[model samples]
Target: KLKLSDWFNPFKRPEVVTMTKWKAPVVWEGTYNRAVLDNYYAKQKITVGLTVFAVGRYIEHYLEEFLTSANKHFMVGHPVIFYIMVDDVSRMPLIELGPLRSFKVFKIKPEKRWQDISMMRMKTIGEHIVAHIQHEVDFLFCMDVDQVFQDKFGVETLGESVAQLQAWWYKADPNDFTYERRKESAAYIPFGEGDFYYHAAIFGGTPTQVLNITQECFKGILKDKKNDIEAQWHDESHLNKYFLLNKPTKILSPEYCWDYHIGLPADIKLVKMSWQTK
Candidate 1:
């Protein structure tokens, strides 16, 4: 069992530390409608943390589409605290939807060597979420800014310590995917018979529990010196390895984060769009 103090230690490490100065964007106070937001805020008061790599032009489009869909469907009736993490905010498109709830955009400068790849991006996002969990939020969801929600993502779906969507590739034997068995540079995790692969694209849990699990998984991935290659899908791969032996929370239905890459599952009630849709 990891102690709470150990969970906070990952941020103090020099590898994850950031010295680059970040300047806040001009706060467009009037853009957000406060009256409408107050009504929703009174009902569903949950904090959701969303991470986006707003560097290139395409990523910007992706983020906008995501927010638009989320605003109309997921966050329309429910109250939520949405936090968007971005590399640069100079080009972020202005959103004029009625004040729905508390929404804040945080600007962060990535380390000099870190790029926008999944591995580095996940590490950066994990760091940001850890800080938020330690401070304000009680519940946290680490979401990829690329996807959009098609329905209300209420708290009723999330239960206990952690909730994760099962991966599409979930049938291979555990030894085949286990870190100990795979020595290649590619990411691979043990997939025992009848086991499921936890998709990292959408995961939520108690802020503290998730903070601990994320930090531990991040540390395990960094231990692999070979370009930090061990798990198949960056942070997701490492998470599979960690959770395979010691499961975290409950496995959520694919409805929580249905991907277009896979065929529709009868059990899924909601749909989440992926990059392939465009």
Candidate 2:
């Protein structure tokens, strides 16, 4: 029963970039009032969804820690449905999730090449959304399995469409962005024409919006494969292309998906989630 304006005021953070030219909010630690957001969503009783992939070695190497931390930090105080896709259902861990949280495991076939594995996720996620996810949660987020939640990643992150800024290149010049350079590739972003380099580690929105994102990105990947050309960053390159064509409604600062190894900077007030050591 709360309006969007009651919880989000883009003018609050004078020190940091707060809103995009397209009017999308760039989420930073101090820019939002989580208590207000919590109360608002609480009244509505919203259920959030998180999708993660843990195929092959990833299941043994990162799934447990990732799920453990997420259960504690992600959308604290709200219900969360974790859609976990793994290659072998038997290898799934038996971790205990906290109250208000549950997970569903799906078996998927592993691709021969690592790039195909990453690109195929777009197709898998799109199919699942159409089958059931659209009706289960009001908001859905797809994230990489290699990162762990470190702080309160709460309701303040929910939006019509959310994209995470790449920690390393959030401040880099657009010309320096690692966009696909080949014209033949469907993900091409012609030089000097992109906005920000988004990390594929985290992206989400309403299930309907996410379905559009995944399907569009998957189409681009299929086209690239047909032309026998692959984008420089595989699915990520296509993701950047998708966001460019349709700007994300909300952007999360690098703080939301930071790298601990990169010495802490002044602009970052909190580390909500950090990329696991390589």
Candidate 3:
């Protein structure tokens, strides 16, 4: 049922045209309809693979809040499997999950230094991020454990390959992008060859796409390691390279993942998740 009120005074400017100024589509929150997306994924019956790595206090720091909010936001009324890598398995809490949600816990030893942790994050994920969920899930979302959902992540965000705008560069000039700059690094991007700067903390796509991207990053990470050149932002630099080299099917707005330290802005309907400071 649909109705338009004759007395309603909807605001519309004569020259108010909606356009996104990015090579990849800018996924703004205002443009999406929640009910529509909810219905769409419900009928589609798609399974989502969710992955995160947490060692020691990192797991204890964000897991509870993350899962609690995930109950309210992340892929509601759908099948979602959470693949968690942690050093201390006992820290995982029993949080309420969605309609068809479950967890897969893995034991992974942590590194001595935080730098090693950053370097090893993608490598571990690359090896196992998609393997177990390949046959079981259609698409998957790989995110850092240090985030909490403040807004609902619905079906609209799902695509064949998806990338999210980093909080700093959703609408910035491409020339100012923080893409890997060295030709020696595997994640290098020459001048005038980038679309946007994407955050490595959150991204996903279909099984095939996610797998390919992870493996792609895995290979690049290996190259950078072999040559003794670490990308400026570690795996994130590699992610920017991959997305620039191979455009994502869809792009997520910064509202999907903003810094908690930053106050909310008019454009951001909800801060899907806030980035944690180490």
Candidate 4:
């Protein structure tokens, strides 16, 4: 549906950083042509899977709005399978999904502490991928439930391994990133070395690739748990370490997961998703 000129255009938006040192595309708004991706992917009839975990009061307070908004914007024209994990299946929202979209709910045990809840998501997601997610979808996206979709989150977001740039630290110094500093912890990143800080709220890739991501992060969590030590940001610290050793193929701009409380900067051309009120 698009000409070669439309799809292969060079970086026209020079104002923002377009590519990383590792050669992964940093997906800012104007950097991609969605119509081209839509047209290209439509031919492949790819199904994108999204995983979200909701426990405690998050199931009641955030799940519905998140699903409703995602139905409106996430992966607009392609087939989508929403993997919803919750402590209580009865609390799953009765949402009427748009065309080419449906949801599957899975029950999970409630974790008492918030930190445990955060870290356990990696283990749970990895288990599901091994059980059936690998067979059901061509690509997978794992996200935090406390966010709502805002604009078109389409095929342009897809890649082999994707990382979302942390909004507050996207432009901050690598020396100051909140990486796990302790040498004893599996998530440790020495002060002098690192890339952009990544947000764990949203991440995706092929099911196999995502499974690798989950497994490595969960392994780090287990190591810390066995040592009676927790990283500063729990799973997020481990995720950064994992991506550091195995770099992502594509990186999303802060625009993909902006925190409106920070106020919109001029560089963020679009806000695809935003954090729900805390």
Highest lDDT scorer: 2
Writing each residue's lDDT as its tens digit, candidate 4 over 131-210 gives: 99999999999999999999999888898999999999988889999999999999999998998899999999999999
lDDT, each prediction: 0.53, 0.91, 0.75, 0.90
Steric collisions counted per model: 12, 0, 0, 0
Alpha-carbon runs more than 4 Å astray in model 3: 1-24
Candidate 4: where are CA atoms >4 Å away?
A: 1-10
lDDT of 3 at 275: 81
Residue-by-residue lDDT tens digits, candidate 1, 1-278: 32223212223323321111221111111112334443544455645444445555466787777777766655444445666766678657676554545567777665553322555655665676665644656566667676777755543334334545453544344444434436453234433432455676766666666666667666666676447544544567666666655555545445556666777654343453343362
Model 3: ten consecutive residues of lowest lDDT: 1-10
lDDT string for model 3 (1-278, tens) is: 21112211123212221233433345565555557666766787788888888776646768887777776888876888888788888888887676788888888888997766865776676667445667878888888877788777877677788988888776677778888889999998887778678898898988778778878887888888889988888888888988877888778878888975666766566677788775
Query: Considering every candidate listed, which one attains the maximal TM-score?
Result: 2
Q: Rank the candidates by lDDT, best first.
A: 2, 4, 3, 1
lDDT string for model 2 (1-278, tens) is: 65657777766667777888897889888778889988888999899999999887646669999999999899989899999999998778988999999989899999999899999999999999999999999999999999999999988889999999999998889999999999899999988899899999999999999999999999999998899988999999999999999999999999999997878988888899999986
Off by over 4 Å in 2: 1-5, 9-12
TM-score of candidate 3 to 2 decimals: 0.86
RMSD, candidate 2, Å: 1.3
Predicted structure 2, TM vs. truth: 0.96
CA RMSD of all predictions: 13.4, 1.3, 5.0, 2.0
Query: What TM-score fits each model?
Result: 0.67, 0.96, 0.86, 0.96
